[PDB]
C-alpha cells in the first residue's frame, strides 16, 4: 500500500497556477482530488504550479 504525499501540481499548458494572492489550500481541482496547500511555486521554466497533497513518487 502507499500514502498521500505533498509535492507542487504536474504543470499543464491549459492548468497554470497564480500567486499566494489568487492561490488557496483545500481543493480546487476535482480531478486531482488532492488536498491545495496554497503556496505557489515556479515548477518550470516558462511554466508555474501550485503546492497540492497527492499520489507522488518516492
Same mark, same amino acid.
Given at each position: 500500500?502507499?500514502?498521500?504525499?505533498?509535492?507542487? !501540481?504536474?504543470?499543464?499548458?491549459? %492548468?497554470?497556477?497564480? %500567486?499566494?494572492?489568487? #492561490?488557496?489550500?483545500?481543493? =480546487?481541482? *476535482?480531478?486531482? %482530488?488532492?488536498?491545495? *496547500?496554497?503556496?505557489? =511555486?515556479?515548477?518550470? !521554466? %516558462? =511554466?508555474?504550479? #501550485? !503546492?497540492?497533497?497527492?499520489? #507522488?513518487?518516492?
Amino acid at each position: 500500500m502507499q500514502t498521500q504525499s505533498t509535492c507542487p !501540481e504536474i504543470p499543464d499548458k491549459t %492548468s497554470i497556477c497564480n %500567486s499566494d494572492a489568487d #492561490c488557496t489550500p483545500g481543493s =480546487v481541482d *476535482t480531478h486531482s %482530488s488532492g488536498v491545495a *496547500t496554497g503556496r505557489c =511555486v515556479p515548477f518550470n !521554466e %516558462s =511554466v508555474k504550479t #501550485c !503546492e497540492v497533497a497527492a499520489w #507522488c513518487p518516492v
